[PDB]
Design a protein around this ligand. Sequence first.
Ligand SMILES: CCCCCCCC(=O)O
Length: 182
Amino acid sequence: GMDTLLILGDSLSAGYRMSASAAWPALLNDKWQSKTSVVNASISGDTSQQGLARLPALLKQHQPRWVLVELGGNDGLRGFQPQQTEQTLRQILQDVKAANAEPLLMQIRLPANYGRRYNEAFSAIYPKLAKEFDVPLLPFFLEEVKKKPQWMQDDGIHPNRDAQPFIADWMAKQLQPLVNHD
Ligand SMILES: CCCCCCCC(=O)O
């Protein structure tokens, strides 16, 4: 069957200031041509808590086989306590599993110039949770994308539309073992 991958993300998945159809999850949906459906449920600026608030309706609506969780970066960019992000992501993971879906957790990191103890504590939550729940820990693309000015919006913060095909292709590779297409 044609399973659904739900993406529960922030602007890194929604695309910042662009059409939904331009963002990499839609490009991935197109690449997969109904082998698998990708539903992007991402909102620019969302904290982990905001994503968690949206999750139950999405699980009910979409009954996904997998949920790619790409959240917490906004919490970290706002300096909130890592344990709160960890606990929120924990609850998301619990809810995904309780809906008979498989979570996939994307590692998030802050940039190299961020406060370093804090950044390390923030980034550590992701491998910890992936081990705790025994779920896939997906790699994070942003630092590599930021190396390409031609893939970044003017702010130097958000990937642009030209980045999206590259991210889609890379994500397809990361997700290949999970969807197991013919
Ligand atoms: C560096 C951590 C990643 C942050 C991405 C979220 C930005 C936004 O959602 O507008």
